Scaffold this active site. Structure first.
Site, mmCIF file in Angstrom:
data_model
loop_
_atom_site.group_PDB
_atom_site.id
_atom_site.type_symbol
_atom_site.label_atom_id
_atom_site.label_comp_id
_atom_site.label_asym_id
_atom_site.label_seq_id
_atom_site.Cartn_x
_atom_site.Cartn_y
_atom_site.Cartn_z
ATOM 1 N N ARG A 81 17.806 29.539 99.129
ATOM 2 C CA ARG A 81 18.089 28.319 99.875
ATOM 3 C C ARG A 81 17.118 28.183 101.035
ATOM 4 O O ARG A 81 16.621 27.110 101.265
ATOM 5 C CB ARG A 81 19.543 28.377 100.359
ATOM 6 C CG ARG A 81 20.554 28.235 99.183
ATOM 7 C CD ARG A 81 21.970 28.675 99.588
ATOM 8 N NE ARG A 81 22.102 30.125 99.571
ATOM 9 C CZ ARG A 81 23.245 30.776 99.709
ATOM 10 N NH1 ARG A 81 24.399 30.110 99.913
ATOM 11 N NH2 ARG A 81 23.244 32.091 99.553
ATOM 12 N N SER A 82 16.851 29.265 101.763
ATOM 13 C CA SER A 82 15.903 29.204 102.884
ATOM 14 C C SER A 82 14.553 28.761 102.344
ATOM 15 O O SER A 82 13.900 27.897 102.938
ATOM 16 C CB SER A 82 15.769 30.587 103.560
ATOM 17 O OG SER A 82 16.915 30.864 104.353
HETATM 18 O O1 LIG Z 1 19.947 31.740 98.856
HETATM 19 P P1 LIG Z 1 19.845 33.237 98.957
HETATM 20 O O2 LIG Z 1 18.437 33.673 99.276
HETATM 21 O O3 LIG Z 1 20.779 33.806 99.964
HETATM 22 C C1 LIG Z 1 20.238 33.877 97.253
HETATM 23 F F1 LIG Z 1 21.541 33.519 96.898
HETATM 24 F F2 LIG Z 1 19.359 33.248 96.366
HETATM 25 C C2 LIG Z 1 20.148 35.353 97.070
HETATM 26 C C3 LIG Z 1 21.307 36.190 97.227
HETATM 27 C C4 LIG Z 1 21.220 37.609 97.006
HETATM 28 C C5 LIG Z 1 19.951 38.191 96.624
HETATM 29 C C6 LIG Z 1 19.790 39.692 96.354
HETATM 30 C C7 LIG Z 1 20.026 40.250 94.820
HETATM 31 C C8 LIG Z 1 19.067 39.457 93.822
HETATM 32 C C9 LIG Z 1 17.619 39.550 94.287
HETATM 33 C C10 LIG Z 1 16.668 38.903 93.688
HETATM 34 C C11 LIG Z 1 15.235 38.984 94.092
HETATM 35 C C12 LIG Z 1 14.713 40.146 94.756
HETATM 36 C C13 LIG Z 1 13.319 40.200 95.114
HETATM 37 C C14 LIG Z 1 12.453 39.099 94.805
HETATM 38 C C15 LIG Z 1 13.000 37.945 94.144
HETATM 39 C C16 LIG Z 1 14.386 37.890 93.789
HETATM 40 C C17 LIG Z 1 21.465 39.921 94.482
HETATM 41 N N1 LIG Z 1 22.518 40.525 95.042
HETATM 42 C C18 LIG Z 1 23.748 40.114 94.609
HETATM 43 C C19 LIG Z 1 25.048 40.564 95.015
HETATM 44 C C20 LIG Z 1 26.241 39.997 94.420
HETATM 45 C C21 LIG Z 1 26.131 38.983 93.401
HETATM 46 C C22 LIG Z 1 24.818 38.532 93.003
HETATM 47 C C23 LIG Z 1 23.643 39.084 93.596
HETATM 48 S S1 LIG Z 1 21.946 38.693 93.286
HETATM 49 N N2 LIG Z 1 19.766 41.778 94.782
HETATM 50 N N3 LIG Z 1 19.026 42.354 95.848
HETATM 51 N N4 LIG Z 1 18.989 43.699 95.489
HETATM 52 C C24 LIG Z 1 19.608 44.040 94.337
HETATM 53 C C25 LIG Z 1 19.833 45.221 93.584
HETATM 54 C C26 LIG Z 1 20.584 45.144 92.342
HETATM 55 C C27 LIG Z 1 21.107 43.881 91.872
HETATM 56 C C28 LIG Z 1 20.872 42.689 92.645
HETATM 57 C C29 LIG Z 1 20.105 42.783 93.903
HETATM 58 C C30 LIG Z 1 18.792 37.323 96.479
HETATM 59 C C31 LIG Z 1 18.881 35.929 96.693
#
Ligand SMILES: O=P(O)(O)C(F)(F)c1ccc(C[C@](C/C=C/c2ccccc2)(c2nc3ccccc3s2)n2nnc3ccccc32)cc1
Ligand SMILES: [Cl-]
Ligand SMILES: [Mg+2]
Ligand SMILES: [Mg+2]
Length: 289
Positions: free
Chosen positions: A225-226
């Site tokens: 979103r950012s």
């Molecule tokens: O609008 P925002 O930016 O707030 C968002 F909703 F798009 C968002 C939310 C959470 C994450 C971290 C992620 C996904 C990261 C993606 C990413 C990382 C690096 C570069 C590009 C994309 C997520 N965390 C959760 C927790 C609960 C439910 C769903 C998610 S998706 N994640 N980070 N580390 C992880 C290790 C294992 C699995 C997922 C992991 C990325 C983006």
């Protein structure tokens, strides 16, 4: 003038051929990759909300404290658009002091929040500002006091007037908090109109003015979103600035922003929304009513 018609067409063509997925995948493939050594240091583990989301070392905001200067936040500098943004994660229970310290040190006058507060599981964010005037917040670690002064609540967003006081110097400042409340995780805003209204309200406030430190923008991870928010604002800027608004390459601007922070814009629909928002925004701005 009515050349915006060609834009709407090219947009319809991407829609029709289902190429949003293609453009977005190509961005993911071409996106810069830089080291994030500081973010990965063991002592910084509890300063990161997510294992895989880290700020690049070259663009990370440093806290001016001798102890640990680390905060998961990145400076995005758009040269042509002449705008700067700090993108950071929803503050954690132990990084609220760091967040406001960064707001102080960088001289930002506005904070843009695009997510909602701390759920009882994952994909949350700590309550980092006062909910009531009489219940001010004091961050002892960074010696800051935060007070809620007023709050204007609307259907999809809320604007708050805050007072931030550096307890060491007793100097105080006004911070504007713009909170878009209806933008879901990995989702899109209720409509381009709502998003655009919100954006214009942030612009109108002057928080984005080069006279201040950069605006601090955050959601949960500080990338989806950012990233959608800043990409839209910057593309609107370039379209107004340049002679030919049709010359703006959204994909390219996004890749440029990605040199400063990984993962900006998390789904092809968000990419599409940013294109829609920019085309609509450009009409209203290049319009007359
Ligand atoms: O609008 P925002 O930016 O707030 C968002 F909703 F798009 C968002 C939310 C959470 C994450 C971290 C992620 C996904 C990261 C993606 C990413 C990382 C690096 C570069 C590009 C994309 C997520 N965390 C959760 C927790 C609960 C439910 C769903 C998610 S998706 N994640 N980070 N580390 C992880 C290790 C294992 C699995 C997922 C992991 C990325 C983006
Ligand atoms: Cl990505
Ligand atoms: Mg550098
Ligand atoms: Mg006072």
């Amino acid at each position: 003038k009515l050349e915006f018609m060609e834009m709407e067409k090219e947009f319809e063509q991407i829609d029709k051929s289902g190429s949003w997925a293609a453009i977005y995948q190509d961005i993911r493939h071409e996106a810069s990759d830089f080291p994030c050594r500081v973010a990965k240091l063991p002592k910084n583990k509890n300063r990161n909300r997510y294992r895989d989301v880290s700020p690049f070392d070259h663009s990370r905001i440093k806290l001016h404290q001798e102890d640990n200067d680390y905060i998961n936040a990145s400076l995005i500098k758009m040269e042509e658009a002449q705008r700067s943004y700090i993108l950071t994660q929803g503050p954690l229970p132990n990084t609220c002091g760091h967040f406001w310290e960064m707001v102080w040190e960088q001289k930002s006058r506005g904070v843009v929040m695009l997510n909602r507060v701390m759920e009882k599981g994952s994909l949350k964010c700590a309550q980092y500002w006062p909910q009531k005037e009489e219940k001010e917040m004091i961050f002892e670690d960074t010696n800051l006091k935060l007070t809620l002064i007023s709050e204007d609540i609307k259907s999809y967003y809320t604007v708050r007037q805050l007072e931030l006081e550096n307890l060491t110097t007793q100097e105080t400042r006004e911070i504007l908090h713009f909170h878009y409340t209806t933008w879901p995780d990995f989702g899109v805003p209720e409509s381009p109109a709502s998003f655009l209204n919100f954006l214009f309200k942030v612009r109108e406030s002057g928080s984005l003015s080069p006279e201040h430190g950069p605006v601090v923008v955050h959601c949960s991870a500080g990338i989806g979103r950012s990233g959608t928010f800043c990409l839209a604002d910057t593309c609107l800027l370039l379209m107004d600035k340049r002679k030919d608004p049709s010359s703006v390459d959204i994909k390219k601007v996004l890749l440029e922003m990605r040199k400063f922070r990984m993962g900006l814009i998390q789904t092809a629909d968000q990419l599409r929304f940013s294109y829609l928002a920019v085309i609509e925004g450009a009409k209203f701005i290049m319009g007359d009513s």
